[model samples]
Target: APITLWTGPGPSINGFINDTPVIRCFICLTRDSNLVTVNASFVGEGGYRIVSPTQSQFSLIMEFDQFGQLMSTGNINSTTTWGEKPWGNNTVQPRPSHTWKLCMPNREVYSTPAATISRCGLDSIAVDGAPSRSIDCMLIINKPKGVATYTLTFRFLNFNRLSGGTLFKTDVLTFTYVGENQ
Candidate 1:
């Protein structure tokens, strides 16, 4: 049932999963080839770094457990560049190599969130055959925390074939800022 792969708008790559903001298909092929959209809108101060598409480097650690759900998350261990990942034939996410969406807003939010994979969870730096990539942050985990207005979304997917700049870039893999200090 899991033998799906499709891409060909240019370089080829398409992705979709119902969780965390996951929307990758490269904005419907650039939506007219404008190609100028970057949102690290984490209200910047510097908290987003990406070097994917063979460059490796993965990280997105999020944890909030006082019953606010999202008890634990991972990434930020081996720090990529494919020291042998997912397996074989020198694979470091080939054929459509970049698509990352992010979201971490105020509580009561989670839509179709359920991601479970095998191996790579010792403290994640992902070592040992080094093949475990989960791209479903959370659309529903334990959403329900004070809610003043939370917004977290990082959906960037350029696939590849000239997305340029450091091999290819798609970041926003993280956004942590939990609250409840009263």
Candidate 2:
């Protein structure tokens, strides 16, 4: 895990944040005996799913923030998200099926047309020593025009049939498209 982000331009000028989470902290346990935020997993193992525009007029690389300051820029490619997972190709997979579900962009929000949930495939995989259970999903944003900002809400829901409940996660990404068609 190289230094992924810096607080300022030059890496040495200020502090930086790494992709790896703090796994173990002996000092917190030794000094104050606290392990609340010591080695917690804020971001899940799969990491965040970022949507990007294909057109050069828009940008997946982000820069500005709420305070109108020049923020750090980064690209959210396939390798950065679900692509890094070990479950074969990150695309819709085939297990014991002759059927197929295609990935497409849908679920547009309100009057805004630049955002979509992007279609994902659903299938089950066999876990060792147990019956095949749990649905595995994969989504890909398959963008926008003009010089404007929009809010896209990427939502994921996990249903636990064994426990009989559900868990939902929502991520909102707002970005502005500033360039003409390129």
Which ten-residue region of model 1 has the weakest summed lDDT?
27-36
How does residue 153 of candidate 1 score in lDDT?
26
- Highest-lDDT candidate: 1
Q: How do the residues 90-171 of candidate 2 rate in per-residue lDDT, one tens digit apiece?
A: 2321121111010111223223344333222112122221221222221212123222122112222232221221111111
Model 1 lDDT, full chain set: 0.23
User: After aligning candidate 2 to the native by TM-score, how far in Å is the CA of 36 from where it should be?
Assistant: 40
TM-score of each: 0.22, 0.20
Each candidate's number of clashing pairs is 15, 0
Cα lDDT tens digits, model 1, 100-168, are: 111222243233232222121111232222223222222222223333122222322222322222312
Off by over 4 Å in 2: 1-148, 161-180
Clashes of 1: 15
- By summed lDDT, which 10 consecutive residues of candidate 2 come out lowest? 22-31
